[PDB]
């Protein structure tokens, strides 16, 4: 309500990630803006520690579902905006089939007039010549459905979805996502009926930018309840 009101216009975003995969440490900073009226996010990420040791598409999901567009009839099911400005904790395990896994913990909250996603990522059991550390992912992204259920026992939501990563040999590498979101503030909140976020992502580059980087555009609309 008051939380939803914070998203009526364009909101600045900052993202910060500290990461360690198979011992390779790295850091990413991002900035951009979100317009939840349209379900639209635009971000730019720079690896501030040099070369990113994993492919950029593997971090798209880690890099703010409060910017989803919830249609009018579904607005009572938007956990993410209600929890603002105090925010929520998002945790994932991401299993790359026949490879290693990411574990992430993020806090998503407002710092001033800015929505901030601060993340820590640890990745283990990857193959040094597999698709991830070997950089065999196409620089692109497909559409997915993010399935959300209430987790009443934990005052939050649990989320599951499977990302399809296109590989340079024409194959597809599946990344199973297991996600939980818990409010940062205390007190029981209203939790949604089962629904999903229709998510579309487009990755691009700034051709003058010489640092290792990703430009990410996202379009996210909630769906899956009767109209």
């Amino acid at each position, epitope marked *: 309500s008051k939380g939803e009101e914070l998203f009526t216009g364009v909101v600045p975003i900052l993202v910060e990630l500290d990461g360690d995969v198979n011992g390779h440490k790295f850091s990413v900073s991002g900035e951009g803006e979100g317009d939840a009226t349209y379900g639209k996010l635009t971000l730019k990420f720079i690896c501030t520690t040099g070369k990113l040791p994993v492919p950029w598409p593997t971090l798209v999901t880690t890099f703010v579902q409060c910017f989803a567009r919830y249609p009018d009839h579904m607005k009572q099911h938007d956990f993410f905006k209600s929890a603002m400005p105090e925010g929520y904790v998002q945790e994932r395990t991401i299993f790359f089939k026949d490879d290693g896994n990411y574990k992430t913990r993020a806090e998503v909250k407002f710092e001033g007039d800015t929505l901030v996603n601060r993340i820590e990522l640890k990745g283990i059991d990857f193959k040094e010549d597999g698709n991830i550390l070997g950089h065999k992912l196409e620089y692109n992204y497909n559409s997915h459905n993010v*399935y959300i259920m209430a987790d009443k026992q934990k005052n939050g939501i649990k989320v599951n979805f499977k990302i399809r990563h296109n590989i340079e040999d024409g194959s597809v590498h599946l990344a199973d996502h297991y996600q939980q979101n818990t409010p940062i503030g205390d007190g029981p909140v209203l939790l949604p009926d*089962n*629904h999903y976020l229709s998510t579309q992502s487009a990755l691009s580059k700034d051709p003058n930018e010489k640092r290792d980087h990703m430009v990410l555009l996202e379009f996210v609309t909630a769906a899956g*309840i009767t109209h």
Partner: nanobody
Amino acid sequence: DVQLVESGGGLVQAGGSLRLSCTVSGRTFSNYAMGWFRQAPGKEREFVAGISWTGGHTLYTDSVKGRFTISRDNAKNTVYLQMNSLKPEDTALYYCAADRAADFFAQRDEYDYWGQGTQVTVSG
């Protein structure tokens, strides 16, 4: 809480096909894992097919594998059971069932809610 109404049943010749429907009224359809069961006179209800709330995970009893398809339309409160290559042994009263989903999977049992059923008769 929720009410289930089956339809699409009838008589068809062995090798024919039928599409059953189950319409869910009341609470939010996407909250429920959905299943189809079938019963021959005097025998028990046996599980036929089950679908997760998301539609992404399905289960089938062996004897219908590759002939029946369960699917759902979460915006239309309906689950369907496409039954192809029907055999006389498929003759039965077909029940729709529902259960508040605990996770993202389908389930074979422990359904709380039941329709009255739609008759399917496969002539031999």
